[PDB]
Amino acid sequence: PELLGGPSVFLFPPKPKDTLMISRTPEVTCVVVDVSHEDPEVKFNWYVDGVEVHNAKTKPREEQYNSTYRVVSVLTVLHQDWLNGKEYKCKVSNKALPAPIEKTISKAKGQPREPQVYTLPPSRDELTKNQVSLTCLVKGFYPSDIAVEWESNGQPENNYKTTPPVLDSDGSFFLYSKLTVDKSRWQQGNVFSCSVMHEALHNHYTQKSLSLAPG
Amino acid sequence: LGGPSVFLFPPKPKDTLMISRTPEVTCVVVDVSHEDPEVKFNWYVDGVEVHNAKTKPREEQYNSTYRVVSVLTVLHQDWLNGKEYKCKVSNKALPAPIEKTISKAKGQPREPQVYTLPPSRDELTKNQVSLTCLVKGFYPSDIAVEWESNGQPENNYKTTPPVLDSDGSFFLYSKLTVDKSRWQQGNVFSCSVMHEALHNHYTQKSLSL
Amino acid sequence: KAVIKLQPPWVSVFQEESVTLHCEVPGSSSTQWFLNGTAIQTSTPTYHITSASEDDSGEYRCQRGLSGRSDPIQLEVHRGWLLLQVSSRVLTEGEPLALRCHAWKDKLVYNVLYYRNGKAFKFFHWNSNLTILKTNMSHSGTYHCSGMGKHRYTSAGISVTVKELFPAPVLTASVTSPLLEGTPVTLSCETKLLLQRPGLQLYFSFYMGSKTLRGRDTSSEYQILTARREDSGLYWCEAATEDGNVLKRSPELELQVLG
Ligand SMILES: *[C@@H]1O[C@H](CO[C@@H]2O[C@@H](C)[C@@H](O)[C@@H](O)[C@@H]2O)[C@@H](O[C@@H]2O[C@H](CO)[C@@H](O[C@@H]3O[C@H](CO[C@H]4O[C@H](CO)[C@@H](O)[C@H](O)[C@@H]4O[C@@H]4O[C@H](CO)[C@@H](O[C@@H]5O[C@H](CO)[C@H](O)[C@H](O)[C@H]5O)[C@H](O)[C@H]4NC(C)=O)[C@@H](O)[C@H](O[C@H]4O[C@H](CO)[C@@H](O)[C@H](O)[C@@H]4O[C@@H]4O[C@H](CO)[C@@H](O)[C@H](O)[C@H]4NC(C)=O)[C@@H]3O)[C@H](O)[C@H]2NC(C)=O)[C@H](O)[C@H]1NC(C)=O
Ligand SMILES: *[C@@H]1O[C@H](CO[C@@H]2O[C@@H](C)[C@@H](O)[C@@H](O)[C@@H]2O)[C@@H](O[C@@H]2O[C@H](CO)[C@@H](O[C@@H]3O[C@H](CO[C@H]4O[C@H](CO)[C@@H](O)[C@H](O)[C@@H]4O[C@@H]4O[C@H](CO)[C@@H](O[C@@H]5O[C@H](CO)[C@H](O)[C@H](O)[C@H]5O)[C@H](O)[C@H]4NC(C)=O)[C@@H](O)[C@H](O[C@H]4O[C@H](CO)[C@@H](O)[C@H](O)[C@@H]4O[C@@H]4O[C@H](CO)[C@@H](O)[C@H](O)[C@H]4NC(C)=O)[C@@H]3O)[C@H](O)[C@H]2NC(C)=O)[C@H](O)[C@H]1NC(C)=O
Ligand SMILES: *[C@@H]1O[C@H](CO)[C@@H](O[C@@H]2O[C@H](CO)[C@@H](O[C@@H]3O[C@H](CO)[C@@H](O)[C@H](O[C@H]4O[C@H](CO)[C@@H](O)[C@H](O)[C@@H]4O[C@H]4O[C@H](CO)[C@@H](O)[C@H](O)[C@@H]4O[C@H]4O[C@H](CO)[C@@H](O)[C@H](O)[C@@H]4O)[C@@H]3O)[C@H](O)[C@H]2NC(C)=O)[C@H](O)[C@H]1NC(C)=O
Ligand SMILES: *[C@@H]1O[C@H](CO)[C@@H](O[C@@H]2O[C@H](CO)[C@@H](O)[C@H](O)[C@H]2NC(C)=O)[C@H](O)[C@H]1NC(C)=O
Ligand SMILES: [Zn+2]
Ligand SMILES: [Zn+2]
Ligand SMILES: [Zn+2]
Ligand SMILES: [Zn+2]
Ligand SMILES: [Zn+2]
Ligand SMILES: [Zn+2]
């Protein structure tokens, strides 16, 4: 007398940065968990607005810590298609299911709203430390899909962390990104840049600079 | 396997960090049947039984099951010193009693640094501006943040979740939105932060033009 | 006309399950089966579906020997995790209804919920069926269930209709109260059949206070030939089917007789 149950399916969108730059390759990922030794064969079919496509790749399966298998199929999507709201369906067939599971994903719906991007210098109080925080406030944006980076002198600055998007009171999203730098790099007048990728920006990109004033 | 399920919830951070408040742990039992007899609770603090929990009558839920809640008050210093709180639930529908344990997040506390940041000059073109509170370097992640001005709470703000920083501490930001005219008239705003590792578990930082 | 019995009695079954339909009435082993208004190439009084498929879904009727054609049963064959099986889709008030939250491959689910029109009305720690021994119109609705296995699974909805046979009666009197001593009065137990039931008669009985005035009889009238003061009281009646499966009472009427 065995508990009723079979595999489960999770379907994931591309990464925002991959969607926003035509040079990258965005993918949707269909993940099947709890595949047993008893019914191990999994079949994927994929559809884009209802039309079957044949270019997905299945990854070699992986036995998980709990002696079930995780099986993953990845489908490359076209830049324009994902951004223009096409719907991507993964159908998963397996003998432990009473019928195939179908999951559909697309870009978030709703009118896109342009990020406003503000750079904020360190608080005067923080200038007593050895490292200072440079802040990038990105607000007013929709949908919540966004990428934020920092750079200085044309090189990526990687000592930053960015908050998740947070839903604001008017339906849009905001976040903050914090770049930590050595105080002397600030005090010497180095220019830092916060760059934002979002679909409601012109060319999907903008950047704002932050530096200690001269003189 | 068919019985009730148990969830044990901590106090709210703000209640643990203000000595005038009454922090509580809450043991919640769901999927109680109309036909199940009394759901019984035993409570332990560091393994020692206590008798001052308040257990409510069962409450019918919209899905026709019943929900029972028991609440145990926790003492301010006990919680902060890391005492462990165990709820043990017994009932005919459970072949063995279910025990859950909860305590404050463990590990060495570190107090937040709190900095207020004025609106960017570029935002001054708008009708509303953003006042920011950066709260960084704190451990554990339990924290509370609010804003005031002239003795009144300011309610038009949102605060990020804590984010794990690269040194294993947490940070967050809080954003208070105000009409630009209020900022430009020199009104004073305050970001108030409660965290265990602060002196008396709180600090306040002001911000004004 | 004949009557189809299902074994097991569920009108909704999973792909690959079995069910046996029984054509019942003495006598002749030459049965005609109809699926969707159309005869089938076997003719025992038992039709066995060994492994159900989409080809077994539809309307079944049966004729045996010399009897009429059964009323039809709708068998549906489904795929899914959980199936809310019912013993009938369309019933008359008084008849029993069984419901079952059935798991695919007879697997185990626990903490089972039964729903009607989207509202859960019964919870069982162990998967149990539900029987409503005596339905009425208010049991009409769309039923489903949910239960916990490895995850929580939910059945699709199934519609059940229970038809009212006759409204509760109203006791009336042929004269307005108060009436004079000596006046004749006829009491009437008023209701009406809501369904065509060709040979069906209701049976009526009349009460004064808790006292029986006249027991079960096909007459829906009761005559007080010459009213007396002592007839002042509360009057009511019951209306029943022949077999008492549906039995309903009236409210009480105040009748006063003056001296
Ligand atoms: C047996 O074990 C396995 C493995 O165990 C797990 O891993 C091991 C190592 C241990 O750590 C163990 O403790 C772990 O448990 C178990 O497998 C897990 O099963 C659970 C469910 O039981 C799955 O839970 C869902 O997780 C979702 C999020 O998954 C991501 O994030 C987690 C970390 O948080 C990662 O571990 C996952 O791997 C997922 O990570 C994402 O993966 C994507 C695909 O690879 C990545 O995107 C791709 O990235 C590549 C490059 O890397 C390219 O960029 C591609 O382009 C891109 O497509 C992605 O970056 C990566 N993200 C991160 C952060 O890493 C949750 O979303 C999901 O929640 C949904 O469903 C819940 C139901 O369980 C429900 O409660 C939720 O509400 C939510 O439901 C959705 O909710 C949203 C909004 O709330 C709604 O909008 C939706 O409509 C609604 N949908 C649904 C369907 O309800 C689940 O929590 C878990 O992912 C899975 N883990 C793994 C690794 O596969 C298994 O359960 C065990 N079995 C038993 C019996 O124990
Ligand atoms: C019949 O219905 C009942 C009632 O349902 C409710 O009403 C209907 C209409 C629906 O709306 C329904 O969604 C409602 O929830 C059903 O009951 C529910 O049953 C489910 C499980 O089946 C319970 O699920 C758990 O939820 C936990 C979180 O609960 C909180 O948040 C939700 C909102 O998201 C609220 O709905 C809950 O009420 C809980 O809310 C918290 O309540 C606390 C106690 O009151 C509050 O704290 C107190 O607050 C007061 C102030 O009022 C003071 O401050 C006190 O001091 C303080 O103590 C708190 O503020 C409040 N928060 C919020 C945000 O409101 C999840 O934690 C839990 O997840 C764990 O377990 C899962 C297994 O189920 C597992 O998958 C998860 O991953 C997770 O597992 C944990 O993993 C984490 C790591 O991430 C670890 O920390 C843990 O160790 C690990 N543990 C375990 C055991 O796994 C569950 O999802 C649900 O809570 C419960 N609702 C109610 C109201 O009780 C019932 O299921 C139905 N039955 C059927 C058959 O359908
Ligand atoms: C289909 O079948 C289902 C079951 O399969 C039927 O559902 C059942 O319906 C029953 C009949 O109404 C219902 O019974 C009620 O249960 C409640 C609470 O659980 C109970 O309080 C009710 O008790 C009163 O009624 C009964 C007679 O029906 C009396 O014997 C009793 O003494 C109570 O009387 C009072 O309320 C009446 C009005 O309802 C008055 O006439 C009577 O004089 C008395 O009045 C006073 O006291 C009142 C407070 O009690 C007060 O407010 C008032 O001012 C007076 O002082 C009753 O037994 C079942 O609970 C229900 N079962 C389920 C599972 O739902 C369903 O009806 C069927 N549907 C159809 C369409 O036929
Ligand atoms: C008997 O007739 C019914 C009704 O036409 C058939 O059921 C339909 O057929 C398929 C499923 O098999 C579905 O596309 C429809 O939704 C059903 N219609 C309705 C109104 O429910 C059934 O297949 C027929 N049975 C046989 C054996 O031919
Ligand atoms: Zn294995
Ligand atoms: Zn483009
Ligand atoms: Zn664009
Ligand atoms: Zn301090
Ligand atoms: Zn203290
Ligand atoms: Zn689950």
Numbering used by the authors:
A (entry chain A): 232 to 446
B (entry chain B): 235 to 443
C (entry chain C): 21 to 45, 49 to 282
Task: Quote what the paper states about this structure.
Fcγ receptors are cell-surface receptors for immunoglobulin G (IgG) that play pivotal roles in humoral and cellular protection against infection. The hFcγRI is a major immune receptor expressed on the surface of macrophages, monocytes, neutrophils, eosinophils and dendritic cells. Human FcγRI is a 72-kDa transmembrane glycoprotein that recruits monomeric IgG1, IgG3 and IgG4—but not IgG2—with high affinity (KD ∼10−9−10−10 M). Intriguingly, hFcγRI is the only receptor displaying a third immunoglobulin-like domain (D3) of unknown function.
We determined the crystal structure of an optimized version of hFcγRI in complex with the Fc fragment of a humanized IgG1 (rituximab) at a resolution of 1.80 Å. A dimer of Fc binds asymmetrically to a molecule of hFcγRI. We designated these surfaces subsite 1 (interacting with chain A of Fc) and subsite 2 (interacting with chain B of Fc). In hFcγRI, the interface in contact with Fc is composed almost exclusively of residues of domain D2. Remarkably, two-thirds of the binding surface of subsite 1 involves interactions with residues of the lower hinge of Fc (Pro232-Ser239). First, residue Leu235 of the lower hinge of Fc chain A is buried in a deep hydrophobic pocket of the receptor. Second, because of the high resolution and good quality of the electron density maps of our crystal structure, we identified eight well-defined water molecules bridging Fc with hFcγRI. Essentially, domain D3 undergoes a rigid-body displacement of up to 11 Å and a rotation of 19 ° with respect to D1 and D2 at the hinge formed by residues 185–187.
